């Protein structure tokens, strides 16, 4: 009804205020900020979700752009209020707007230490290679025989991979051939897009 009735609904933690907070928290970016920031990518916007706990779950890909390892760093979270600042947060300083760094052309929002270790374990090859001799149909059979346990992540086999390149003005061409590779490179190629 009024403002203080909603305040008493907030102070007593009603069930419906969590649903209305989930409604108001979506399509509403918020600015995450490390103190003190190191560069321009030490503060950028984020579209938050609602979880439990009393802390902010930060996306791991942008912690290198923060240079803020998980040492209990006191991050400030700033709310853009009006629609000018809300669309300025969503369309310009969201992390989906900048995959490169303002310092160099190399991405500082690159896959960091844990995920690059997992990817290096994915793209590694062996000589023993207990899934030897089986020819994989593509990324699909590669992830299938890795997840079924009959074949390992290290197998120097031939994989028919569908690849695309925009040699024309944005026109991708379809081609598939056999390449000397491993299974985990094809499982990464399942996540790699067409271009």
């Amino acid at each position: 009804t009024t403002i203080k009735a909603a305040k008493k609904m907030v102070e007593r933690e009603e069930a419906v205020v969590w649903d209305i907070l989930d409604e108001v928290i979506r399509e509403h970016p918020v600015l995450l900020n490390r103190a003190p920031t190191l560069h321009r990518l030490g503060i950028q916007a984020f579209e938050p979700v609602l979880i439990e706990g009393k802390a902010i779950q930060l996306h791991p890909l942008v912690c290198a752009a923060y240079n803020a390892d998980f040492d209990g760093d006191q991050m400030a979270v700033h709310v853009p209020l009006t629609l000018e600042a809300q669309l300025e947060a969503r369309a310009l300083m969201m992390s989906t707007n900048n995959i490169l760094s303002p310092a160099n052309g190399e991405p500082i929002i690159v896959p960091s230490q844990d995920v690059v270790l997992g990817l290096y374990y994915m793209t590694r090859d062996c000589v023993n290679a207990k899934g030897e001799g089986m020819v994989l149909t593509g990324p699909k059979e590669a992830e299938r025989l890795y997840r079924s346990g009959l074949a390992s992540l290290h197998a120097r086999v031939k994989v028919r991979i569908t690849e695309y390149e925009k040699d024309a003005n944005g026109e991708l061409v379809a081609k598939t051939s056999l390449k000397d590779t491993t299974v985990g490179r094809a499982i990464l190629w399942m996540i790699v897009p067409k271009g």
Partner: protein, 76 residues
């Protein structure tokens, strides 16, 4: 336009005038009483204004003639 605004910035041309006319459209959507050209599917007016931007229906001169038509309708 929830995860990608690159189609919007390549159909408009730059970031600042795009987000200025998008905020103008959202201000005309919030208290102006205008109807959205994009379906809502449980979204706030900001990403609706961004989806109207990336659909090619909202631009600078398009919003200019859109508010000029409403001004000529109100002043008649």
């Amino acid at each position: 336009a929830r995860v990608t605004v690159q189609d919007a910035v390549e159909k408009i041309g730059n970031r600042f005038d795009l987000v200025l006319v998008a905020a103008r459209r959202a201000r005309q959507m919030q208290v102006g009483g205008k109807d959205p050209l994009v379906p809502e599917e449980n979204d706030k007016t900001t990403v609706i204004a961004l989806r109207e931007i990336e659909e090619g229906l909202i631009n600078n001169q398009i919003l200019d003639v859109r508010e000029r038509q409403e001004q000529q309708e109100q002043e008649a």
